[PDB]
Design an enzyme around this catalytic site. Structure first.
Site, PDB file in Angstrom:
ATOM      1  N   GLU A 126      19.170   7.327   8.146  1.00 24.94           N
ATOM      2  CA  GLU A 126      18.439   8.473   8.703  1.00 24.94           C
ATOM      3  C   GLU A 126      18.222   8.410  10.200  1.00 24.94           C
ATOM      4  O   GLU A 126      17.855   7.326  10.726  1.00 24.94           O
ATOM      5  CB  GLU A 126      17.101   8.649   8.047  1.00 24.94           C
ATOM      6  N   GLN A 182      -0.195   6.071  11.342  1.00 22.41           N
ATOM      7  CA  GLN A 182      -0.015   6.636  10.027  1.00 22.41           C
ATOM      8  C   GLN A 182       1.407   7.168   9.838  1.00 22.41           C
ATOM      9  O   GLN A 182       1.901   7.870  10.740  1.00 22.41           O
ATOM     10  CB  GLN A 182      -1.033   7.782   9.912  1.00 22.41           C
ATOM     11  N   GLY A 183       2.062   6.828   8.724  1.00 18.53           N
ATOM     12  CA  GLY A 183       3.457   7.211   8.406  1.00 18.53           C
ATOM     13  C   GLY A 183       4.476   6.152   8.817  1.00 18.53           C
ATOM     14  O   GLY A 183       5.637   6.232   8.360  1.00 18.53           O
ATOM     15  N   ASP A 220       1.324   1.812  19.998  1.00 17.54           N
ATOM     16  CA  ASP A 220       0.978   1.212  18.675  1.00 17.54           C
ATOM     17  C   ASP A 220       1.745   1.912  17.573  1.00 17.54           C
ATOM     18  O   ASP A 220       2.367   2.964  17.786  1.00 17.54           O
ATOM     19  CB  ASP A 220      -0.563   1.432  18.423  1.00 17.54           C
ATOM     20  N   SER A 221       1.792   1.322  16.402  1.00 12.04           N
ATOM     21  CA  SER A 221       2.213   2.016  15.189  1.00 12.04           C
ATOM     22  C   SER A 221       1.092   2.928  14.691  1.00 12.04           C
ATOM     23  O   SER A 221      -0.073   2.804  15.148  1.00 12.04           O
ATOM     24  CB  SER A 221       2.604   1.022  14.131  1.00 12.04           C
ATOM     25  N   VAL A 228      16.905  16.883   8.618  1.00 13.10           N
ATOM     26  CA  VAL A 228      18.251  17.505   8.726  1.00 13.10           C
ATOM     27  C   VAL A 228      19.240  16.553   8.199  1.00 13.10           C
ATOM     28  O   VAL A 228      19.253  15.343   8.643  1.00 13.10           O
ATOM     29  CB  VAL A 228      18.528  17.877  10.239  1.00 13.10           C
ATOM     30  N   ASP A 261       0.143  -7.567   1.849  1.00 16.48           N
ATOM     31  CA  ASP A 261       0.569  -6.118   1.820  1.00 16.48           C
ATOM     32  C   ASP A 261       2.094  -6.056   1.935  1.00 16.48           C
ATOM     33  O   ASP A 261       2.683  -5.769   2.997  1.00 16.48           O
ATOM     34  CB  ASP A 261      -0.103  -5.366   2.936  1.00 16.48           C
ATOM     35  N   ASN A 265      17.162  12.153  12.067  1.00 17.62           N
ATOM     36  CA  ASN A 265      16.278  13.265  11.831  1.00 17.62           C
ATOM     37  C   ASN A 265      16.054  13.369  10.325  1.00 17.62           C
ATOM     38  O   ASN A 265      16.994  13.696   9.541  1.00 17.62           O
ATOM     39  CB  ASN A 265      16.925  14.554  12.342  1.00 17.62           C
ATOM     40  N   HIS A 274       0.829  -1.213   0.000  1.00 16.14           N
ATOM     41  CA  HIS A 274       0.000   0.000   0.000  1.00 16.14           C
ATOM     42  C   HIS A 274       0.845   1.237   0.000  1.00 16.14           C
ATOM     43  O   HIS A 274       0.263   2.324  -0.211  1.00 16.14           O
ATOM     44  CB  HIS A 274      -1.042  -0.065   1.103  1.00 16.14           C
ATOM     45  N   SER A 299       3.749   2.961   8.126  1.00 13.41           N
ATOM     46  CA  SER A 299       3.488   1.835   7.213  1.00 13.41           C
ATOM     47  C   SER A 299       4.718   1.485   6.395  1.00 13.41           C
ATOM     48  O   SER A 299       5.487   2.357   5.948  1.00 13.41           O
ATOM     49  CB  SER A 299       2.340   2.144   6.291  1.00 13.41           C
ATOM     50  N   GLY A 300       4.854   0.181   6.157  1.00 14.66           N
ATOM     51  CA  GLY A 300       5.982  -0.335   5.364  1.00 14.66           C
ATOM     52  C   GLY A 300       7.191  -0.617   6.226  1.00 14.66           C
ATOM     53  O   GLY A 300       8.108  -1.297   5.721  1.00 14.66           O
TER      54      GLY A 300
HETATM   55  N1  LIG Z   1      -2.226   1.253  14.479  1.00 13.84           N
HETATM   56  C1  LIG Z   1      -1.719   0.451  13.335  1.00 13.84           C
HETATM   57  C2  LIG Z   1      -1.691   1.255  12.059  1.00 13.84           C
HETATM   58  C3  LIG Z   1      -0.649   1.032  11.188  1.00 13.84           C
HETATM   59  C4  LIG Z   1      -0.414   1.834  10.096  1.00 13.84           C
HETATM   60  C5  LIG Z   1      -1.276   2.897   9.791  1.00 13.84           C
HETATM   61  C6  LIG Z   1      -2.317   3.113  10.660  1.00 13.84           C
HETATM   62  N2  LIG Z   1      -3.131   4.267  10.369  1.00 13.84           N
HETATM   63  C7  LIG Z   1      -3.294   4.893   9.162  1.00 13.84           C
HETATM   64  C8  LIG Z   1      -4.198   5.944   9.252  1.00 13.84           C
HETATM   65  C9  LIG Z   1      -4.529   5.871  10.624  1.00 13.84           C
HETATM   66  C10 LIG Z   1      -3.866   4.915  11.337  1.00 13.84           C
HETATM   67  C11 LIG Z   1      -2.500   2.351  11.787  1.00 13.84           C
HETATM   68 CA   LIG Z   2      18.788  13.166   8.143  1.00 10.33          CA
END
Ligand SMILES: NCc1cccc(-n2cccc2)c1
Ligand SMILES: [Ca+2]
Length: 223
Positions: free
Chosen positions: A52, A174-175, A171-172, A57, A84, A54, A40, A177-178
């Site tokens: 990486e 948004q951002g 938890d993980s 920077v 995925d 920061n 995705h 992912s991957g």
């Molecule tokens: N909490 C797990 C998870 C993993 C990756 C993305 C998201 N997410 C994307 C939009 C909102 C939460 C949640």
């Molecule tokens: Ca950097």
């Protein structure tokens, strides 16, 4: 990552940032030429950023290498998020060193209760939005299949597992992912999806990398 900690610069040396003008997803370096990420996260025009901390920077350990190709899994379904996973080849090999290093693939699947390290530059709040510039980390266990299914009726396939805390708070997000879920020094998961972040009874859901090892190795061997 919500409820995590600052990893420390270059302590997660297989973590890459995918950049298309800006960071949009994580990934994991698996050899000098190849990165694992989530399907995705596919787009054209990816630059892989290695070394990486920061991401805003230039600090001196980065390598920026454009992708020469992306390969989304043959069976990826973007509606169910089954399978995925994608592979990204670098136009030139990374220089491997103590801060830019590959993560081995698993030989067998990790069990519920195993401790894992999840990392990324995603949102750090359950409600509202705050991005970090430095890499964030979270230690979390794999949850049982049965509790993952009960958390998300009708939606957990054999290519997914849950990890985190049914109580919420960590938890993980948004951002992230991957990016990687590493357990006992092997890549067992890819940050995939959930319902919000860090909500009660809604742990993160991760692509089950041990199901894909033979696809990964044969794809690398002919591309
Ligand atoms: N909490 C797990 C998870 C993993 C990756 C993305 C998201 N997410 C994307 C939009 C909102 C939460 C949640
Ligand atoms: Ca950097």
């Amino acid at each position: 990552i919500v409820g995590g900690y600052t990893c420390g610069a270059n302590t997660v040396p297989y973590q890459v940032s995918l950049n298309s003008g800006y960071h949009f997803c994580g990934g994991s370096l698996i050899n000098s030429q190849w990165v694992v990420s989530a399907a995705h996260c596919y787009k054209s025009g990816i630059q892989v950023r290695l070394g990486e901390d920061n991401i805003n920077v230039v600090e001196g350990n980065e390598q920026f290498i454009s992708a020469s190709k992306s390969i989304v899994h043959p069976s990826y379904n973007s509606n169910t998020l089954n399978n995925d996973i994608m592979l990204i080849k670098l136009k030139s090999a990374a220089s491997l060193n103590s801060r830019v290093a590959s993560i081995s693939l698993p030989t067998s699947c990790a069990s519920a209760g195993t401790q894992c390290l999840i990392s990324g530059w995603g949102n750090t709040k359950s409600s509202g939005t705050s991005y970090p510039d430095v890499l964030k980390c979270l230690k979390a266990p794999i949850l049982s299949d049965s509790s993952c299914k009960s958390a998300y009726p009708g939606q957990i396939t054999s290519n997914m597992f849950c990890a985190g805390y049914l109580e919420g708070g960590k938890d993980s997000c948004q951002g992230d992912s991957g990016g990687p879920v590493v357990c006992s020094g092997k890549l067992q998961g890819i940050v995939s999806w959930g319902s919000g972040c860090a909500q009660k009874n809604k742990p993160g859901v991760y692509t089950k990398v041990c199901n894909y090892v033979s696809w990964i190795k044969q794809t690398i061997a002919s591309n």
